[PDB]
Structures are given as C-alpha cells and as structure tokens.
Amino acid sequence: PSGTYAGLPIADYGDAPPLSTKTMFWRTSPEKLPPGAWEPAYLGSKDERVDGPSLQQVMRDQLKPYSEPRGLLPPQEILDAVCDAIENRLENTLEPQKPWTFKKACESLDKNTSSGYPYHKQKSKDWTGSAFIGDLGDQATHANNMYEMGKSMRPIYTAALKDELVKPDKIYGKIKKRLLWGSDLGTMIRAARAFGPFCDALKETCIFNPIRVGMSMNEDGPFIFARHANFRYHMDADYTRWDSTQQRAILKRAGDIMVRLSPEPDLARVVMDDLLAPSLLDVGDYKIVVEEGLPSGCPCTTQLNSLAHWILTLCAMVEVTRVDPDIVMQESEFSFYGDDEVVSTNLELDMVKYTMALRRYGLLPTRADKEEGPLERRQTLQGISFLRRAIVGDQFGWYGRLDRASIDRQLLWTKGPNHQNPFETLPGHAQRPSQLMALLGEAAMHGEKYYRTVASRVSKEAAQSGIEMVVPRHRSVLRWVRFGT
Amino acid sequence: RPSGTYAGLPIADYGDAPPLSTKTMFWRTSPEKLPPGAWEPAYLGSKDERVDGPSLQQVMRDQLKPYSEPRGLLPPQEILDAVCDAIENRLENTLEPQKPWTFKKACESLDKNTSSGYPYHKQKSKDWTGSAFIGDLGDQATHANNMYEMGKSMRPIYTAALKDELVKPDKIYGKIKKRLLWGSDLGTMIRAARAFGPFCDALKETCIFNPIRVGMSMNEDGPFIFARHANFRYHMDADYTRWDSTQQRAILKRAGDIMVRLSPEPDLARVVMDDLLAPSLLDVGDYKIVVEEGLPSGCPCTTQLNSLAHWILTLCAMVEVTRVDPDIVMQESEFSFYGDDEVVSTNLELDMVKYTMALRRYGLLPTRADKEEGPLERRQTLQGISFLRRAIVGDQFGWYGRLDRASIDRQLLWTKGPNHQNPFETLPGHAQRPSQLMALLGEAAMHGEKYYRTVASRVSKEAAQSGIEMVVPRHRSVLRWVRFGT
Amino acid sequence: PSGTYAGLPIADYGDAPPLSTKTMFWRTSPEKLPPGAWEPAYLGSKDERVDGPSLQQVMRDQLKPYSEPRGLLPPQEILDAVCDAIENRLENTLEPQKPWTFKKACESLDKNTSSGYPYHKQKSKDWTGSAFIGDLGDQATHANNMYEMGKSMRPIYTAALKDELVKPDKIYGKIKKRLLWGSDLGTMIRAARAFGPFCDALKETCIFNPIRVGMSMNEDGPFIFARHANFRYHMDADYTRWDSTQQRAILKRAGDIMVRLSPEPDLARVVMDDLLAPSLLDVGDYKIVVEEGLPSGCPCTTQLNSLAHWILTLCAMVEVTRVDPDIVMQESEFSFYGDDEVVSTNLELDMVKYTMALRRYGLLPTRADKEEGPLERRQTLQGISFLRRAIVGDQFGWYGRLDRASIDRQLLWTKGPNHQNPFETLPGHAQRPSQLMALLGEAAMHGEKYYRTVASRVSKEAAQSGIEMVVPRHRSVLRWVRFGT
C-alpha cells in the first residue's frame, strides 16, 4: 500500500485498535454546570453532546504539522558551542550512575498503561509483580536480548487522542483533541534501560540545572523560584505545537548528549539512533512515516525534549546577545519541562531579534497572556506560570500557586472507570480524601474569602463519601502548604 | 431462550460446567477391615466399585427436588418489620464501622484452591501472581471490578457439585444421598466480596457478643460463648432438614436489606445484593437452570446472609408465639447461629407445640434433634445440645466443646489426600499428619483416662510409619494444653 | 511410527523444537584468536567456521554408544559385598532428613532453564518468585499427586547439544558436540521430592563421604585434598564416555541405596523405578527408546551417577586386592563428582588387573594425563586434578588452582545473549565485577609474574567497561582467595 495519509507517507496497514470512544471523567454533583465550564474532550459519533467529525478525522488534523516544512537549524557554529556547554555543564553537575538492569527497566514501566504494538495490552495483564510473563514477557525478553547485543529494532508507535478537560470552544466550536504517541513495549524497555540512568541523575539535579522534571512544586518551587528571582529580566514564551515543530537534527544533538552521559554509551547510541530514525506511527488504517517533530512515547522522551528546548533557547540567546553560551548561562537562569519554560537573565536581550531568531528555527512562540510577539519581558517574575501554577511572591518567599478556575474544575470532576457520557455521576468516590485535602491546601494560598468558598464545597462532598473531613482553619493550612513537611 | 425443564425447573441455557467428580479425598489410614456400620465416603457415581447405582447426574436430580416445592408462608408482616429493625439496631450498636474494600483486598480474600467457576472453571491459584489475577482470571475479575464501581449489574452463574465427605454407610448401600454444592462465578466472587467483606469482617469481630458465630474459635471463644448461653433457663437445639432449600427469597431479601444498609457502600452493595437474590442460574452439566428459590450458596457473604436469615426466622417464631417485642426476647435470650446450625437459649416460657407450628408454617423443617419427634423438646440443662459438630459440655472449669468419640474414631480411620477412585486404597507414611494427629489426642483427653489411653493406642502406631517421630504425652499433661491455651 | 534412529528403536513422534544454531559465547577482543585456541562448539549448516553435517546428524553420532553391547556385571559375590558396605557407611554418616514438600521441590529447580516436555518453556516464564502458575503450574500439580499416591509416570527426556568451548579440532576435524538430556518438569519435581532429602544429606557430608557434589573448591577444597594426601598412592583414571557406557543394573544398585536412605522410601521406590526404566528420549522428529546408559535429565542423577561410580571403583579394588571392602575403604579416600574421580589409597594395587576389571565392566579409562595403558599411579598428589583444577601442595596446605590455559580462555570469551557468530564483540559489556575478580584471584595463585600479564589484560578488558575498578596488589588478593570466608 502507498500511500499519502494525512500528508505523510504510507508504509503498511495499521494494526491499531479503533480510537477510544469513552472517557474517565465524572461530574461530582448533578448541578447545572456553570457556563464556560471546561469539559471532557470530544468523544466521537457516540458523543451525545455534539455532532462533530470522526475521531479518525480529528487525528488527521493533528498530523498536519509533521509534514509542514521544517525551519532552519541554528547557525552551525553557535549550535556546536551550545551543545558543548550544555554537555560540559551536565558533566560537572551529574553523578555517574549504575547501569539499569532488565529488572529495573521493567520495574520502572507504568503497568497501568498500554503495551502498544502489537498486543496493545494493558501492561499489568502480564506482570507477576516482579517480571513480565506470557506475551509481554517474551516481547520484553527479546527487546532485552537485542539491547544487550547492540542490535537494531524499528519501533512502532500507536497514535492516540488525549482524554482531558478542555475549553467549551474545543468542543462546541472548532473541535480539537490532542495527539498522543503510544510507544511499544519493546522500545520502552530498551530506552528505559538505555537512558534511565541518565534521566535519574537529571531528576536528582533538577534544582541545580534547568531541566526541571521530577521537581516537587511545593518542596522545590520556593528555591527554584528564588533562583530565577536573582535575575533582572524574566520572560515566558508560549510555544504552540512545540512537539510537531522539532527538527530531528536538533533532537539528534540532544541525543548525542544523553548518550555521552549515560553509562552504556555503545548501546545507547543504537536505541537513540533507533528512536530518532524516521518514525512509524500506526493510526489504524495505516502505519505511516513521520520523519520530523518529536516521537513522544518513551520514558526518557520528556527529558530529551527539554534538552532540545535548552539548546534552542540558548541558540537564539547567543545569536542575539552574542555572548558565549556558558557566559549566558552564568548571566541567566532557565527552567524547562518539555515545551514548558521560564527564561531569566541579566543580559540585555533584544526581544524583536530573539522572536525573529526562533520563528526562524521554525518555532511558534506567542505572548503568554496577550497572544502576540515580539515576546515582552518584564522586571517582575510574578505573572509567569510554570506547570500551570502561577509564580507568586510574598514577604516569606516565592511559591507556585494553582489558580482559581483550575481548582474550580478539580472539584466539578473526578476520575473514574471509562464511560461514554461524562455528566453521569458514580456513587461515593473513595479516593477523594488524599486529593481533596491538597485542594484545601492550594486554595488557602488565595486567602480567607476564596478558601471559605472551597472549605464548604469540600464539606459538602466528603461527608457523604468516606468518613467525615476535618476542615482545618485557613491560617493552619497556609503553614502546612507554604512551610514543611 | 430454551425452556424446557430439567429436574422440574426451567431451562435457561446450555451448560458449560465440567462433568461431576467421580473421585474422593479420603484414603483409608490402615489396610485392615473397616468395623461394621462404619462411615465411608459418599457415592462416586457409575464408577463406584462399592455399589450399583444411578449416574451422579441422577443424584443431582434427587437433590434438586426441593427448589421447586411450594415455599412456606411469610411470617406476619408486622413482626417481620418489627424483628428486622431490632436486628438492625443490635448490629448498628455492635459493629465498628469498617471502611471500603479495595480491588486488591477482595482478590486477596478469595480461597485460591477452590474453582473459579464459570466460565474458565480453573483452580484460582492458576492465574494468581501472589497479589493479582493475570491472564484469564485477570480479565474476568478486572471486568467484574469495573461493573462494580459503576453500579452496573451482572447475572451470576453458579456451578453445581456434590459434597465429598464421610457419610453413614446407609447413604451408600441403601437409598443414595450426596449433598448439593453451589459454586459462584469469580465475577460474583470478587464483586460480592467488596460489597460485603467489610460487613462480614465487622460481624466476625463481634461474634462473641453476637449470635452469628461465623469466625469463631471453638477452643478460644467456645467457653465464653457457651457459658453465655447457660445464663438462660431453657435450651433448645431444634434442628433442621433441608435448611438451604426451604429458604424464601422474600426473607432472604430482608436479610440482604440489613447488610446493604450496614455496608460502607450501600449504593454499590445494593446492586450486588439484588444480583445475588435474583432468580438464580445454576449450571448442572447439560443445562443452566433457573432457580427462583431456596438459598444461592455460592459467594463469600453467603454464609453470613444465611445465618442472618436464620436469626430473622427464629426471632419471628419466638415473637409470634410469646408475643414479646423482639428487643425484649433478645435481651432475654442468647442466640447462636451458623448457617443452619443453632442453639437457642431463653428464660421466656415458650410454647413448644405452638413454636414448631410457626416454624413449619414458614415452611421450615425442624426435627427433634437426632432423637426423633415432636413438637421440639426444651431442656433445663445445656448438656447434650451440640454445635459446630462438637458436644457442648460443662465441668468444674467452665464450658467447652467436645468432639465426641465416635467422631474421633472415624478421623483415625480416614485421612485426606489427593483425589482417587478407590476409598479403601491406602497411602504411604503420609508425611504431613502431625498437625491433625495432635488434635486427636487433645480431643480424646477430654473423655477421661480410659479413653485417651486407647486413642494413645492408635496415634502411636500411625506415628511409626510417618515423616518424623515424637513421644506421646501424658493425659493430665495434654488435657491442660487442650482446655486453656493457646 | 517405527523403528530405528542411530541404532535405537523408535517409539513415537517427537515434540522437541529444533536444535539451537547459536552460541552464548562472545569474543572479548577482535584480535585474531591465538593458534590452537578453543572456540564454541560447531553450530550446524548456518555456522560459518565450516560446512559440516547436520546437528541432527551430530546428535545421531552422539547416540551411537547407547546401543553398544553393555559391559559385564561385577561378580555377584563382590557386587553385594560392596553395595551393602557403601550403604552402611552412609548410614553411619548421614543425618536423617525430613520429607521434601511440593513447596520445597518447586523451589529447588533451576528456574532459568527449559521446562522440557511438552511446553518446552523456560521455567521462569511461569513462576511467581513463589510457585508455578498457568502451564507448568498444572504440570507441577499433576506430577505431585502421582507422587503422594505412589502411582507411576513415564519420563520423557528431551535431547540437546551442549554449547561450550571445545578444542578447535572438534570444529575443524571430526566434528563432535556433547549430548544433554533435558528432563520434564513432572519427573523434575517428582524426583526432587523423592530424592532431595538424600542429596541434601550428601551435601552436608561431602568432606567425609567421597561424593563431593555441592562442594566449594575454595572453602572445602583445602581439607578434601588434605584427606587424600594422607595416603601413599594416587590416580587420575580419566574416563571416556562415562554416561553412555553405564549399566542400568548398577544404576539400579545405586538407585536401591538412595531409595533406602530416603524419608519416604515407598514413594521414592516408584520415582526411582521410573527413572531407571527404559528411557524415552525426544530427538526432534521422533521419540526413541534408550534402555541402557545413564539417563541424565533430572536432579538426583549426578549423585546417582557418582554413587554408581563409587560402586564400580570399589568393585575393581576388592576384585584385584582380594580385601574386604571395609578395609579397602578404610585404607583409601575417594572423590567422585559424576565421572570426575580421584582415588587415593595405601593398598598396593595391581594396576594391570585393576584397569582390566574396569574395562571388563565396559568402562573406558584413558591414560591419566598421557597416552596408553595399563593405567598408572603416582607417589605424589600433585599432578592429579579434579573439577578442572590442579591439586596444589603448598606450605599453607592443599588447594584447587585453575590452570593458566583455562584462564587465558575465560579472558578470551564472555557469556552473553545467543548469537550466530561466536567471533563478534559484546558491545561494551557490564557484568564482570564477580567473574573478573575470581580470575584475577585464580591468577593470584600462579605467582607474581603471571599475575602482572593478567592484570593488564583485565584492565583493557576494563577499558570500554561498566566499572572503573582498581587492580589490587598481588600479595593482597592472593591472601583473599586462599583464606576465607
């Protein structure tokens, strides 16, 4: 077969199961949902709420970017300098690790999610609680032999559509649903082993270096935010379709680093060379080839993507200021989490030329709160968000706070088993407490008035659920929330 | 679909059940002759080299007669209402509110050596990792769990069996009788165990102060329990024939009503409880039949729910006859239930003629113990009544339960081992009977020196040819160990 | 079907999957292997070191001697004399065991190794760190019942060819490759239950009783060899094709002893009687019938085999010396591990008559470690070997030292995943901390000079390497190996 499907080559028939039609989200009251209330994404024909296109269609629209012409590399000379700085920096900061055994590679894998090609099994189905058996034991078995023999395996990605809460517009307007990349089990265990050591280190380092993954918001926010705060100029950028705009060239460079700084370089070189080679994506009707943009199924995926964000940010910064990348790194503080950034700096940076330099790499930043570039840069770290918490400073120090609407949305809905109609209500949801408490916390940070507003809504539910809830005093949470513990 | 009848009951579908077992677990302990009138394992079907008899399938038909017999009468509505509230209060006051059971804890609570039942009919340990169910029993449970959380309903499929146990020779050589077993679907097994395990646990904890003794130790809780009965003048053991099959779903619901209301998840437990009591589906080889009535004895909860009904049926009779409100009867009586097994102790001056009627009128079948005839007798001693198949005995040291010598003797003549076709076949040394062997001494020593010494005869020999050897204890020495423990 | 495979009757169709065309060995340097260097054994039609006969054919070659006319029985009057003596000695040494549970037996098994007939799954594929489930589970259950019930089962042995390093000739001359019998899990656990107590007894008296199975060369060596040194004359006796040349009649004699010292003898009788009954072997296309020779699959067999050995040897000595076997055995110290023997004795033994006896039994000693015989004996314990170690006569006592040439190899080759070409290099190995150490300590005992040339090789084998380890001093490590712990 061959084969132009959604702008991209065809290679084979798809072994993809048909796109999930049911959602995990459940309204907690039966009340008339407030106007403009976020909602579970489009569900398909079956979705009673609206009459939108096929899920198969929605997926096509999502593939569009991955065939849009790639932008230009950063000037080769500068790129070399940044890769090497980022490397050199890590070399000095990252602690050499023990290699990961098949056991720990398999131990690490989320057993609640799908094995993907070809068994498309929920991983738990084949897990002893130590190693993998049966169908998946054997895929893993072989994926391990192959990794140890430094031999190559084409990975097969299975596409999906993220079930999440979205603005009503995404539903009753132009229907949009966000694309996923379900890795296969073989590939997962291979990259697990390959770059699980390196990733680990990076998480232990997540306060000292700019890749933030593994960072505790409450526990690390104050310090990380105080750090950015030492710097004169702050900025946000709001990349849209970051993932599908990545150049594989750059990804190779991030991979170059990851390999170098992983304990089995010889064997990593393969998995990474594998992970980056024109990628096969099963959309159901066909598997297709995607040569560009980020291939996002793998354990290490988000770190490698962060690593590119770093590279890309520096590349422009250095071009613009024209200062040696390591210098900029000592006149700057960075936070990265995939597409998620906060760039702080003492260097006088030209916001026009910076915007121009990235849009030239093919990126699509925007003005974080007014949707327009050049990217403004304020004298105040307050008003940028990171991890959808907003940066805030009082007389005690800095902290990331979740905003009103998000905490509103978290009360209105709750996880549950899969179902087709999201306004349905399950019985007395028992995993409420441990979360419901945190909600209590995060609202304290908005003070008294609002906290009362939540204090009640909390009482309302939790009573008619498990046992009773202690509703602590506003000032008593603030201390548990800000300080501790 | 079908319908149709088998064993006088509508046919709902074809049977997936495997064929009924033709073997037993009881290997004669020794190669000698069996003493005359000796108990022997129940009939093995076609292939029993002991007697010519019908197909096991036939024995099943016999066993299935009662579930199509007309039900007895509901106890006067008012008293029913009255007794259920009184029983609900007792439990409301006596049960430490337990918290909801998770998937994991329910899965953990299952006896993994019994069958999984329909569909796969597999020994449960087979898809068991040590904590979860994988593969086949994985799918069925994980599906069964989802249906629960969501409050959707399932149709339980039960699988029939015939109890393999020692029976009085007469049930083999005269008219053949082997007892009906129900076996729940792992689907229901897990579902009904979330809904009702917290309750069964609660009840379990509360069993020295509550008449439902499911979970008791005869050694530890026996003395207390029995000494508790003796505070009451009159005693009756008033024992039932065909208990399970006489049950009225109507009452069984009231039983269920209570457990649901008393569960950490009423909303969820209700959907599961309705499912159990719904006209039941029993896989009997060739067909699955609709059983509208009696008790659906598959699931975990079952035996608690069963006793709960027995509570409700005894109370109704007492209130119907004495005409004292159910809280006063219960403050004037000590009850002991376990499914069908029962002691009833009360100071109230109950009319035994009038009582039996009410019971029979509810369609129950009480007989004068294994002494034959009445009206049921009442006595002013507790001595002689028995419970969980031990004799209730009282001495200078308090009350206790004493498995009787006839009963001890058989245990000497039979030992459990793998399934096989000939009951008179003997094993080797069988190197795992020290646990069992010890108990026998204990049991014996409570019958005075004469006896224990002649049980010291046998427990000696059968210790020679065995895995290890220890010396036989002194009487007074072991009796103490037996009476006050440990 | 019917009815002749390499000289032996057909009984049924085989179910054995095909033979491994692959090796587990991998080269450590790409450097061209020295002249006359051992290599993994031949791997058939896809093997590239030569074009030779089918593995099928090679195995037929291995099966030839099972059909050979058996040798003769020792004189009845000498046979019982010994056997009754051996048992009485065990009886005077062995601490009585308590019966092995299913639970215990299921634990014993080498979990990393094929299930045999009929699933042919590696055991690990079905275990829970706990018990066998699924397939093997059921198999394990059934057999256990047939045990307790004292009913019988027909073992179904699977045939294979040992992947090992061999003298290069055995690839480029007359291709040979050693036969293995895979037992079936049923017989496995069944024999484990029946005969595990006995083997355990043997384990814990392997210094006082000639059957050294389970011994530690390092911990137990210095005192086993010390007992040997207490005697005037010592002898290699080196046997060709032990297992093939065996006589079931004697295997039954050792069977009888074993069964006599088992906690549950009646249960054990059966298992033995099966083990010893004409063995059914699964050779791929067909199952055939092996009436003679030692059937080697299950647990037990190695102790069974040594026990036979014990008998055969003790026979020759009584045969020749004319002396009551109690006196022989009290003017002598034996060491048997399978076919590996060492016989120390004070009795003047007529070497001509003695050898003759063994051959008459249908045995096949070669010359100690030279060519042609009459077998020969020395006045010194040095020069003899056992468990592939040269016995050494040191001021600190006696020991086992792995020879120079054996070391060179363990440095030349590394075990890895199964592959097609033995000559490839295992891309930047990890697992050597334990194995590297041991060989560094092996070389310790060969003097200060030899240790140096080794140290260096160890180190460039620690070049592209998982752990950046020290070379400890010679003196230090030599202290470490000899003395322990």
Pairing of strands A179-182, A156-161: antiparallel
Q: Was A107 annotated as part of a binding site?
A: no
Sheet holding A8-13, edge to edge: A4-5, A8-13, A286-290, A279-282, A156-161, A179-182
Q: Which helix (H) or strand (E) holds C334?
A: strand C332-337
CB of A427 less than 8 A from some CB of B: yes
Task: Please list every residue in chain C followed by a chain break, i.e. its C lies more than 2.5 Å from the next written N.
Answer: none
Name the residue type at position B408. Answer: I
How far is it between the farthest Cα atoms of chain B?
Answer: 67
Other CB atoms within a 10 A radius of the CB of residue A461 amount to 19
Q: Work out the angle at residue B474's Cα, subtended by the Cα atoms of residues B470 and B475, and round it to the nearest 5 degrees.
A: 130
- State the Cα–Cα distance between residues B428 and B437, nearest whole angstrom: 16
- State the Cα–Cα distance between residues A277 and B118, nearest whole angstrom: 49
User: Mutate which of C128, C418, C424, C469 to test chain A, going by most A C-beta atoms within 10 A?
Assistant: C128
How far, CA to CA in Å, does B354 sit from each of A263, A440, B317, B376, C341?
88, 63, 9, 10, 90
The number of C-beta contacts closer than 8 angstroms across A and C is 38
- State the Cα–Cα distance between residues B460 and B473, nearest whole angstrom: 11
How far, CA to CA in Å, does A115 sit from each of A132, A208, C32, C189?
11, 35, 43, 34
Q: Work out the angle at residue B282's Cα, subtended by the Cα atoms of residues B277 and B287, and round it to the nearest 5 degrees.
A: 145
SS3 sequence, chain A?
Answer: CCCEECCEEEEEECCCCCCCCCEEEEECCCCCCCCCCCEECCCCCCCCCCCCCCHHHHHHHHHHHHHCCCCCCCCHHHHHHHHHHHHHHHHHHCCCCCCCCHHHHHHHCCCCCECCCCCCCEHHHHECCCCECHHHHHHHHHHHHHHHCCCCCCCEEEEEECCCEECCHHHHCCCCCCEEEECCHHHHHHHHHHHHHHHHHHHHCCCCCCECCCCCHHHHHHHHHHHHHCCCEEECCCCCCCHHHCCHHHHHHHHHHHHHCCCCHHHHHHHHHHHHCCEEEECCCEEEEECCCCCCCCCCHHHHHHHHHHHHHHHHHHHHHCCCHHHHHHCEEEEEECCEEEEEECCCCCHHHHHHHHHHHCCCCCCCCCCCCCCCCECCCECEEECCEEEEEECCEEEEEECHHHHHHHHHEEEEEEECCCCCCCCCCCCHHHHHHHHHHHHHCCCHHHHHHHHHHHHHHHHCCCCCCCCCCHHHHHHHHHCCC
A360's tokens = 């030239």
Contacts 24+ apart (CB under 8 A), A395-398: A396/A482, A396/A483, A397/A222, A397/A225, A397/A226, A398/A221, A398/A222, A398/A225, A398/A226, A398/A229
Task: Say if the Cβ atoms of A467 and B135 lie within 8 Å.
Answer: no
Q: What is the resolution of this structure in A?
A: 2.8
Distance of CA A218 to the CA centre of its chain: 19
CB of B36 less than 8 A from some CB of C: no
3-state secondary structure of C136: helix
Tell me which chain C residue has its CA closest to the CA of residue A129: C128
For residue C182, give the nearest of C143, C156, C163 by alpha carbon.
C156
Q: Judge whether B345 and B334 are in contact, CB under 8 Å.
A: yes
Task: Say if the Cβ atoms of C129 and B130 lie within 8 Å.
Answer: yes
Pairing of strands B333-338, B180-181: unpaired
Q: Was C385 annotated as part of a binding site?
A: yes
Task: Say if the Cβ atoms of A125 and B146 lie within 8 Å.
Answer: no
R_g of chain C, CA atoms, integer Å: 23
User: Mutate which of C125, C426, C469 to test chain A, going by most A C-beta atoms within 10 A?
Assistant: C125
Which of A134, A426, A428 comes nearest B150 by C-beta? A426
For residue C291, give the nearest of C338, C241, C248, C256 by alpha carbon.
C248
How far, CA to CA in Å, does B71 sit from each of A214, B293, B341, B353, C422?
66, 8, 21, 21, 80
A399's tokens = 């902290």
CA of A427, closest CA in chain B: separation in Å? 6
Name the residue type at position A2. Answer: S
User: Which residues make beta-bridge pairs with B388?
Assistant: none
Cβ contacts (< 8 Å) between C131 and chain B: which residues? 125
> Buried b / exposed e across B209-234, counting CB within 10 Å, b at 16+?
ebbbbbbbebbebbbebbebbbebeb
Tell me which chain A residue has its CA closest to the CA of residue B137: A125
User: Mutate which of A119, A124, A136 to test chain B, going by most B C-beta atoms within 10 A?
Assistant: A124
Q: Judge whether B300 and B200 are in contact, CB under 8 Å.
A: yes
Cβ contacts (< 8 Å) between B272 and chain A: which residues? none
3-state secondary structure of C211: strand
Q: Please, which experimental method was used?
A: X-ray
The number of C-beta contacts closer than 8 angstroms across A and B is 42
Q: Was C282 annotated as part of a binding site?
A: no
Backbone angles phi, psi at C389, to 5 degrees: -135, 140
C233's tokens = 């004359």
Which of B135, B149, B150 comes nearest A134 by C-beta? B135
- State the Cα–Cα distance between residues A359 and B436, nearest whole angstrom: 82
Q: Write the CB contacts of B407 (distance below 8 Å, at least 6 apart in sequence).
A: B389
SS3 sequence, chain B?
Answer: CCCCEECCEEEEEECCCCCCCCCEEEEECCCCCCCCCCCEECCCCCCCCCCCCCCHHHHHHHHHHHHHCCCCCCCCHHHHHHHHHHHHHHHHHHCCCCCCCCHHHHHHHCCCCCECCCCCCCEHHHHECCCCECHHHHHHHHHHHHHHHHCCCCCCEEECEECCCEECCHHHHCCCCCCEECCCCHHHHHHHHHHHHHHHHHHHHCCCCCCECCCCCCCCCHHHHHHHHCCCCEEECCEECCHHHHCCHHHHHHHHHHHHHCCCCHHHHHHHHHHHHCCEEEECCCEEEEECCCCCCCCCCHHHHHHHHHHHHHHHHHHHHHCCCHHHHHHCEEEEEECCEEEEEECCCCCHHHHHHHHHHCCCCEECCCCCCCCCCCECCCECEEECCEEEEEECCEEEEECCHHHHHHHHHEEEEEEECCCCCECCCCCCCHHHHHHHHHHHHCCHHHHHHHHHHHHHHHHHCCCCCCCCCCHHHHHHHHHCCC
Dihedral sign from CA coordinates of B202, B208, B211, B214: positive
Which of C138, C150, C263 comes nearest B431 by C-beta? C263
Q: Work out the angle at residue A321's Cα, subtended by the Cα atoms of residues A315 and A326, and round it to the nearest 5 degrees.
A: 60
Backbone angles phi, psi at A351, to 5 degrees: -65, -35
Cβ contacts (< 8 Å) between C417 and chain A: which residues? 145, 148-149
> Buried b / exposed e across C349-367, counting CB within 10 Å, b at 16+?
bebeebbbbbbebbbbbee
Rounded to the nearest 10 degrees, the angle between the axes of helix B302-322 and helix B77-94 is 130
User: Which chains border C (3 or more CB–CB pairs < 8 Å)?
Assistant: A, B
User: Mutate which of B24, B126, B415, B470 to test chain C, going by most C C-beta atoms within 10 A?
Assistant: B126
Sheet holding A332-337, edge to edge: A233-235, A340-345, A332-337
Alpha helical stretches, state H, C334-389? 351-360
- State the Cα–Cα distance between residues B12 and B1, nearest whole angstrom: 6
Query: What is the length of chain B?
Result: 486
- State the Cα–Cα distance between residues B370 and B365, nearest whole angstrom: 13
Task: Say if the Cβ atoms of C134 and A134 lie within 8 Å.
Answer: yes
Query: What is the length of chain A?
Result: 485
A462's tokens = 């939790």
Which of A128, A131, A266 comes nearest C428 by C-beta? A266
For residue A400, give the nearest of A389, A409, A410, A411 by alpha carbon.
A389
Domains of chain A: 1-19+76-211+248-296 (no CATH), 20-75 (6.10.250.3230), 212-247+297-383 (3.30.70.270), 384-485 (1.20.960.20)
Tell me which chain A residue has its CA closest to the CA of residue C132: A128
Question: Burial of C152 by CB count in 10 Å (0-12 exposed, 13-18 middle, 19+ buried)?
Answer: exposed
Look-up: residue for tokens 């014990």?
Answer: C310
Q: Which helix (H) or strand (E) holds C165?
A: strand C165-166
Distance of CA A75 to the CA centre of its chain: 28
Cβ contacts (< 8 Å) between A130 and chain C: which residues? 128-129
Which of C124, C417, C464 comes nearest A145 by C-beta? C417
Tell me which chain C residue has its CA closest to the CA of residue A265: C428
Contacts 24+ apart (CB under 8 A), B389-397: B390/B218, B390/B222, B392/B226, B392/B343, B393/B446, B394/B226, B394/B230, B397/B483, B397/B484
- State the Cα–Cα distance between residues C137 and C142, nearest whole angstrom: 9
User: Which residues make beta-bridge pairs with B27?
Assistant: B415
Task: Say if the Cβ atoms of C148 and B428 lie within 8 Å.
Answer: yes
- State the Cα–Cα distance between residues B275 and C5, nearest whole angstrom: 63
- State the Cα–Cα distance between residues A427 and A423, nearest whole angstrom: 13
Cβ contacts (< 8 Å) between A140 and chain C: which residues? none
Cβ contacts (< 8 Å) between B417 and chain C: which residues? 148-149
Q: Judge whether B214 and B200 are in contact, CB under 8 Å.
A: yes
Backbone angles phi, psi at A125, to 5 degrees: -45, -30
Which of A418, A426, A466 comes nearest B99 by C-beta? A466
CB of B428 less than 8 A from some CB of A: no
For residue A298, give the nearest of A271, A317, A319, A333 by alpha carbon.
A271
User: Which residues make beta-bridge pairs with B342?
Assistant: B337
Task: Say if the Cβ atoms of C125 and A134 lie within 8 Å.
Answer: yes
Cβ contacts (< 8 Å) between B133 and chain C: which residues? none
Cβ contacts (< 8 Å) between B129 and chain C: which residues? 128, 133
For residue A176, give the nearest of A64, A294, A37, A15 by alpha carbon.
A64
Sheet holding A397-402, edge to edge: A385-386, A389-394, A397-402
Task: Say if the Cβ atoms of C427 and A150 lie within 8 Å.
Answer: yes
Pairing of strands B5-6, B9-14: antiparallel
User: Which chains border A (3 or more CB–CB pairs < 8 Å)?
Assistant: B, C
How far, CA to CA in Å, does B197 sit from each of B111, B188, B189, B210?
13, 13, 11, 17
R_g of chain B, CA atoms, integer Å: 23
Backbone angles phi, psi at A17, to 5 degrees: -70, 160
Q: Which helix (H) or strand (E) holds C13?
A: strand C10-13
Strand locations in C14-98, DSSP E? 23-27, 39-40
**CA dihedral of C339, C342, C347, C349, whole degrees rounded to 10:** 60
Q: Write the CB contacts of C138 (distance below 8 Å, at least 6 apart in sequence).
A: B126
Q: Which helix (H) or strand (E) holds C313?
A: helix C301-321
- State the Cα–Cα distance between residues A141 and A153, nearest whole angstrom: 13
CA of A140, closest CA in chain C: separation in Å? 12
Dihedral sign from CA coordinates of C288, C292, C293, C297: positive
For residue C202, give the nearest of C109, C94, C336, C104 by alpha carbon.
C94
Cβ contacts (< 8 Å) between A124 and chain B: which residues? 132, 134
How far, CA to CA in Å, does B175 sit from each of B51, B240, C468?
11, 20, 83
User: Mutate which of A125, A126, A425 to test chain B, going by most B C-beta atoms within 10 A?
Assistant: A125
Other CB atoms within a 10 A radius of the CB of residue A426 amount to 18
Q: Work out the angle at residue A203's Cα, subtended by the Cα atoms of residues A202 and A208, and round it to the nearest 5 degrees.
A: 70
